[PDB]
Amino acid sequence: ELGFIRTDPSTHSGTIYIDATDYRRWTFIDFHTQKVDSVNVTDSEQKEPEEWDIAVHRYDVKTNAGAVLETGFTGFSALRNADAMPEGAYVEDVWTTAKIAIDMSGMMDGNIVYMESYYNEELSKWLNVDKSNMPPTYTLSNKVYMVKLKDGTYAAVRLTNYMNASGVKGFMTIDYIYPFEL
């Protein structure tokens, strides 16, 4: 009951459910093979897999030389009715040095430890965390993201939830269509 938990071959779709709670973890997702792999960045014996499509760290996401465009669609049944692909320019990952927090334990003292990493600003819009509010607000975009993968095929992805059943944050429920074809 973690990873590719539900899949429907006839509609090329399914649901991924992963424990992205730990700040030391990247969870790699491969839509081609339906595999999920975790890497603890503080363990040099653990390396990223040879093949992967997206990677999630807490609410942050990166692609594997991919590009992403946020659509206006809020569900797959609406997306399947579209007549044409987007004309817009997809967004590639950017290199970051103060974005991916690997240790949050000293945050009450203003000390967050970061790692350097690629990060996709477009796909990470799947959740807006506005810390300036008391209390901070966690807002799902509810949008379908079109992800152009390095092999030229596309995945349609949507973050449907960021909590487990009782409200613990960092459990990510990701619906997908792969390969997405009009």
Task: List residues binding Cl ion (CB under 5 A).
Answer: 96-99
Q: Which is nearer to Cl ion, 97 or 132 (CB)?
A: 97
Please choose which of Cl ion, a second copy, none residue 38 contacts, taking the beta carbon within 5 to 8 angstroms, the exact cut-off set by kind: none
Report if residue 121 touches a second copy, rule: CB under 8 A: no
Cβ burial 126-153 (10 Å sphere, 16+ → b, else e):
bbeeeeeeeeeeeeeeebbbbbbbeeee
Residue 89 CB: number of other CB atoms within 10 A?
Answer: 8
Pick one of a second copy, Cl ion, none as the site partner of residue 85 (Cβ within 5 to 8 A by kind): a second copy
Q: Does 9 bind a second copy (CB under 8 A)?
A: no
Tell the residue number behind the tokens 């790692």, with chain if given. 115
- When CB distances are held under 5 to 8 angstroms depending on the partner's kind, the choice from a second copy, Cl ion, none that residue 164 binds is a second copy
Would you put residue 156 in left (φ > 0), alpha (ψ -120 to 50) or beta? beta
Q: For residues 15 and 18, what is the distance between their CA atoms, to the nearest angstrom?
A: 10
Would you tell me which residues interact with a second copy (CB under 8 A)? 6, 8, 15, 17, 21-24, 42, 71-79, 81-88, 102-110, 113, 134-135, 137-138, 140, 142, 158, 160-161, 163-168, 170, 173, 175
